[PDB]
Amino acid sequence: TEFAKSQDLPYQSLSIDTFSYLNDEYVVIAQPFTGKCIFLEWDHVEKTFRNYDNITGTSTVVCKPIVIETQLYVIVAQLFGGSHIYKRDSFANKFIKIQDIEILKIRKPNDIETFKIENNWYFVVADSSKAGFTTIYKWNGNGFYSHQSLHAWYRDTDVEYLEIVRTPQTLRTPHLILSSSSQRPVIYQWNKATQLFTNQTDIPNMEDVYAVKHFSVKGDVYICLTRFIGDSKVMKWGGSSFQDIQRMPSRGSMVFQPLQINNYQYAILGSDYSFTQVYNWDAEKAKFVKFQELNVQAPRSFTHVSINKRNFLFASSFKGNTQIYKHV
């Protein structure tokens, strides 16, 4: 196979997200410099992506969609003016601002992640400021409210939700991983009794990790550790801790996103200085190997979009044009 170039959208982007609303596939694009949260819609007639709707916010970083019982909610992380929560109205056909995240608890957001634990919906906001604490919110039917703060006085860059097996258990339990500046990645474990994440442990061997993203092959659980300079790493989870698999040189990298397309496991390592490298999983090698080579200016994210047996690859650009790829 190959990732062929579909189209190049004439604007910059930071974070790209996808979701399913009323059996249609949408794509949310966060525009840092303009302010818009750009929603894309699929045209089944012209086989292209239209412009569904926008959400205006002065310095958006993340636009995370949450779908609770067919109702669409969007978390808008802003560096200016504070973060807000929007709700899509089916009747008025618009987005409504229904909730405000206080500007003092969350000041410099950098990543938003969503997860579901025993029929409860949550989301976590990584705050890269010291005064701003990484906070978990909980869905209580009408809106989201503070549930737990983590990593005080830490410059948290990314959050990642994990479901991992702790030896000698046999069932996957919820986990969170926090990446902070000049610091080791932290693994939080979910405690059902207290209904909050505790028992934190550092990931040794990793200094200055920017972000963490996980994938699963053969039932085993892996993660991709990203550095800007130095070497990115791939690790396997084995009961109690993560183990070394391989490593790759990171030349100004901001992304190391694992993707699973058509039961094929891919891994796209972005680069600001050079060409973005796509990796494929090797069954014999139990390792990632060189696959295809992309060319995008300062990639910030890679997201997989599946529509009717058609697989698309969205690549965000911080200085250049955001690119859409076709997987054939």
Partner: peptide, 14 residues
């Protein structure tokens, strides 16, 4: 400066 902010303000990633 809407994006990077100023020095005497709270510092974040950007």
């Amino acid at each position: 400066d809407t994006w990077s902010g100023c020095i005497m303000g709270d510092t974040g990633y950007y």
